[PDB]
Amino acid sequence: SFSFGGFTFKRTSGSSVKKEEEVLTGNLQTLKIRVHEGYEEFTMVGRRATAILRKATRRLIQLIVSGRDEQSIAEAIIVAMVFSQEDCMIKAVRGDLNFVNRANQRLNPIHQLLRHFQKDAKVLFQNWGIESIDNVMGMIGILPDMTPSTEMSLRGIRVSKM
Ligand SMILES: O=C(O)[C@H]1[C@H]2CC[C@H](CC2)[C@@H]1Nc1nc(-c2c[nH]c3ncc(F)cc23)ncc1F
């Protein structure tokens, strides 16, 4: 239904209304983003990874991911975290004031966030948060360093891997 970061997104459930909101990045730039308000589920289909995303307003509730290799799974996770519009993803932006240009009639801020994190997702992964996980057979944790764990995971994130 739409393409974002190389994944085909389809909404499978729920609805949202869009409210324009100014947000402040970690490096103190202002982005004016269309915040989606409501409960939604999406599928994400890539060449090398597939995910199920459950989200609410600026909140990743669950992401289940399967993929070819560590790189392919990290790609899905980064796109999902930007799509979530979470405040910790907005605050993970650091470094050059790259969102200040204004040359184009309109420069999509969610695309700007994804392009930022495609350069380096270390700050994003390190600030997202980790949680203890239940023992669900075939579901493993993935740590900020993209290492598997049976005990902990990035908040809301599980890899489907036997
Ligand atoms: O807002 C936009 O300009 C585009 C770009 C940035 C993310 C989506 C894909 C590209 C967005 N397009 C669409 N988003 C959504 C959408 C629903 N809930 C969401 N929550 C967060 C989010 F972020 C986008 C959405 N629905 C239909 C779309 F067609």
Residue numbers in the entry: 322 to 483
Excerpt from the paper describing this PDB structure:
Host five-prime cap binds to the PB2 cap-binding site, then PA cleaves 10–13 nucleotides from the host five-prime cap and PB1 synthesizes viral RNA. One potent inhibitor of the cap-snatching process, pimodivir (VX-787, JNJ-63623872), is a cyclohexyl carboxylic acid analogue inhibitor of host five-prime cap binding to the PB2 subunit. We have crystallized proteins of PB2 wild-type (PB2-WT) and selected mutated forms PB2-H357N, PB2-F404Y and PB2-M431I in complex with pimodivir and obtained four high resolution structures.
Almost every mutated variant occurred only once, but the M431I mutation was found in four volunteer-samples. In this case, 57-fold decrease in sensitivity to pimodivir was measured. The examination of M431I substitution revealed a 12.5-fold reduction in replication compared to the wild-type virus. Compared to WT, the M431I mutant had minor difference in the thermodynamic parameters of pimodivir binding. The inhibitor bound to this mutant with less favorable en-thalpy changes of 0.5 kcal.mol−1 and less favorable entropic contribution of 0.6 kcal.mol−1. The M431I mutation had only a small impact on the “free” energy of the water molecules. W1 and W4 molecules become even more favorable and the other become less favorable (mainly W4, W6, and W10), which resulted in a decrease of the stabilization energy in the pimodivir:PB2-M431I complex. Pimodivir had comparable binding affinity to WT and M431I variants of PB2 in such a model.
